Design a protein around this nucleic acid. Structure first.
Lengths: 46, 271
RNA sequence: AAUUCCUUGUCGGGUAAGUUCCGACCUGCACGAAUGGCGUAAUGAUGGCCAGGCUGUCUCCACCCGAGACUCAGUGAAAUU
RNA sequence: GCUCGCCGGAAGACCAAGGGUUCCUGUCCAACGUUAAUCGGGGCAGGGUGAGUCGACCCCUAAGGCGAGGCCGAAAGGCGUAGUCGAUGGGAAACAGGUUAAUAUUCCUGUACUUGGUGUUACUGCGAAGGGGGGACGGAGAAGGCUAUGUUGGCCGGGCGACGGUUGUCCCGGUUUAAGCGUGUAGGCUGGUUUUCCAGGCAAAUCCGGAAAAUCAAGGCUGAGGCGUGAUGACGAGGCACUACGGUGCUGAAGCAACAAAUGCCCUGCUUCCAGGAAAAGCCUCUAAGCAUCAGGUAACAUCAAAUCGUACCCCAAACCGACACAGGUGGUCAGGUAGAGAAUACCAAGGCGCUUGAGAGAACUCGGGUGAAGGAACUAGGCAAAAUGGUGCCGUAACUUCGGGAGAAGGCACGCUGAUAUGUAGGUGAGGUCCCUCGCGGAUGGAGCUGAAAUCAGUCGAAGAUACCAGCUGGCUGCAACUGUUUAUUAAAAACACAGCACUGUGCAAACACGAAAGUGGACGUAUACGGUGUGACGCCUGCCCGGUGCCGGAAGGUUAAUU
RNA sequence: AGGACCGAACCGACUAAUGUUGAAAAAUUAGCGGAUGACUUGUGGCUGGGGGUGAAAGGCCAAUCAAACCGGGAGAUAGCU
């Protein structure tokens, strides 16, 4: 059966990447929360 | 020409085609083409604003000259062409200076017929003049509502207007809708009727024929779960309320004209 | 009647026997003319009924070929309590 | 290692996506592997990915995104111009052979090609953020001409048979060779050439377009394949010396023809139809502003440069998505032989596998199958299931019908093999030879050789000749819906939803309407033969009476009636 | 010529059996429907929660839908266990 996760690096970065998060007020707040929490990986970039 | 196909299959019994051999069996004039991407009835917000629009055959836009401001220069008709962006056919005309343009095809226009625009033009079909110089009681098309911007009335397949009077700077017209409207006596109009009259006798014959035109199916509303439509639902076929649009408006007699800005040119609105 | 409560309505047809089916009757509990009425060739993995052919569906089960079940060796769960 | 069995339009081979060292070698067996394990996609270590031509980056844009100013909006922010990003598309160039345990159109050998920089020489009007051309485009169908490829023959080499026969019409194997350069064919499109003039192409223009004359008909463009060269080469079944039987050096014969033939090429073509079929750049041209013994431009030669990143391996799967080494899912490319209409099906080739627990036994019962006396739906809610029909050709074929259908209606007959007609026919293919010729990949004649149905007559074997796989049950009455379609992913596929058609109604364009505090956008680059909404639902015969109620559309004498005063 | 016919790929899912701590959180096997079109499919893009999309089932919107998911108000309230 076809499942939900059909990977694509392009769509992954364009939807959840660093530059996508850094392009909106609410996206920049996502990074601020993950920095304050201490996340080692902020985004799905690499 | 109107011709009825034969019932070789369900889907061809009732199809009625409009065949015109005078049309050009070739490619159109490229310099007057443009890209026309489809919308699906969606706006810049990506929301469906007009329902029942989607798909269909790819189309290229033909740049038509609705203004006809090439005064004092005769033009000869080269050929008639099919235009998918409208119901009427168009004509490729060639001027004496070597310029080519597209125009709406009047009733009895052929290849080789001469036309002309301006006030010094003759009174014959295809020519364009300001309605001030048009004899009253004549039939015209591609009428301008404001001088210089281009025709906006009587542009469909077999549509035409009739000049009924001329009081002053204005003139009165009866539109194909029966409405009696008046416009300035400086708006240009083209003599004759748009020639594709048999376009109304066309019978699609099947659903796919409408999908080719870009029309998506219409779901009524009675069987639509009142969360989606006032007509909503019911156990069986109930429909016990006044006919109403989505968003709650009658749609069975209620008038919705609320302009009030013109309110001067309308005399005999209709019926 | 995709609508008829009384109801397996009554007559007829089909069956040795037909609450279903088909055709008529009309006492339409409570059809009805674009929330359409009556017909309608063709079409339908559509509903109902009748025939020919076919058969282990059945009278009534029998045998056979294989995979498990059973035994040996190895690995080694579960619900529940 | 010898056998057996399975896939073979894949269970083979090459990729994208995705994964990210799973690749190769050595070593280890605790854990991981549904068992053991000396093995492994496991542990440890080492090694491995070589590009001017493949791809990415790069140039160009689509949908769409961002968006200087700007418009709008309590703030956040929204829309959008100029612009700038964005492939799933367009844009220059490399082929064969050989080689590593693991890479290769990337290394080596051989033979080529493309775009730029610099310089020299000769001849010169060069120049764009502009104009024009071109790029540039649909569906279906029809053949014709070709190739990939295959078969047979011939040629070369080898072989004479574990059991009767096999020196012959016998058996096995091989018979391969590219890009590029040259030739410009089958065939397709278009009439060329010179001169004069012009309200057009935001200005100009020798270019495009247009008009009027003269002059010639042969002019050009495009174009598969073939032929030649590339190639005195390479490859080559098998041999000769080494030969740790692990392989390395040398040598290496034939290397032609005919027939058949694609879904691939000519073909972005031809014909035809309506639903009428991207954009931009590169590229070819035109000149302007400007620069002219310069600079620049064309051609020849020479030289330099072509960076950077990816390249291992899996990729219908044990490596991706599914928690698993999970009977699932996953886009593109390659497409052998016999039979066959066929990419179905059966058996095979190349190649790849036997699916990571086995050994015995041969109870009930369950699962998946085979056969069945007599009867033949008596079973059951119901012929559920199963059985059965099944192919080609000819004959033949009802009611009804919208005259198309119904219809493959129903039903009936014949099908193998051998020989002859005919030492292989009709047909297809077409050599040599002869003749013509603008002598050319030419034309005509010519018919060798090759290939090869179908039919008839006769004879013959079997219980059975469409013998296997494959492969319609049929008919009669009737309800509903016209039909093809759509739907409750995961208990409902239907009489429901759509549907063409019909009707009412709204809408005169800054349209109604809709998304939006707004700007604005869609509707529509449309204009009442249009658009939106509602109901009905092909077609045919029809659609009756009622406006008191509710709503909608009008109307006005009067009454009542808000803020305000 | 055809929303034409038979029928593989491909897209679907009418019937039955199996399986139901499954091989599989909807599949397998034997049959079945469509198969030049209102077809199917790859890549990328747009529509965001009282909103979207919907040939309309209250269907779908990441195994979740008569109002998604995450976090917060929040130790909501619970005359009930």
């Amino acid at each position: 059966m076809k499942r939900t996760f059909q990977p694509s690096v392009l769509k992954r970065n364009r939807s959840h990447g660093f530059r996508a998060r850094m392009a909106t007020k609410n996206g920049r707040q996502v990074l601020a929360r993950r920095r304050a929490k201490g996340r080692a990986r902020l985004t799905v970039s690499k | 020409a109107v011709v009825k196909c034969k019932p070789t299959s369900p889907g061809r019994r009732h199809v009625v085609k409009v065949v015109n051999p005078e049309l050009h069996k070739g490619k159109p004039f490229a310099p007057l083409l443009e890209k026309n991407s489809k919308s699906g009835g969606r706006n810049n917000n990506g929301r469906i604003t007009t329902r029942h629009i989607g798909g269909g055959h790819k189309q290229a836009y033909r740049i038509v000259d609705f203004k006809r401001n090439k005064d004092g220069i005769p033009a000869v008709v080269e050929r008639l062409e099919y235009d998918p962006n409208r119901s009427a056919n168009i004509a490729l005309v060639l001027y004496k200076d070597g310029e080519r343009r597209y125009i709406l095809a009047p009733k009895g226009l052929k290849a080789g017929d001469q036309i002309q625009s301006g006030v010094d033009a003759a009174i014959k079909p295809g020519n364009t003049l300001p309605m001030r110089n048009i004899p009253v009681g004549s039939t015209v098309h591609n009428v301008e509502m404001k001088p210089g911007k281009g025709g906006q009335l009587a542009r469909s397949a077999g549509t035409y207007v009739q000049i009924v009077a001329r009081d002053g700077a204005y003139v009165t017209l009866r539109l194909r809708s029966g409405e009696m409207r008046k416009v300035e006596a400086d708006c240009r109009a083209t003599l004759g009727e748009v020639g594709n009259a048999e376009h109304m006798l066309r019978v699609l014959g099947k659903a796919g024929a409408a999908r080719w035109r870009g029309v998506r199916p219409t779901v009524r509303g009675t069987a639509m779960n009142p969360v989606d439509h006032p007509h909503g639902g019911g156990e069986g076929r109930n429909f016990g309320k006044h006919p109403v649009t989505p968003w709650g408006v009658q749609t069975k007699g209620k008038k919705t004209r609320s302009n009030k800005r013109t309110d001067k040119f309308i005399v005999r609105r209709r019926s």
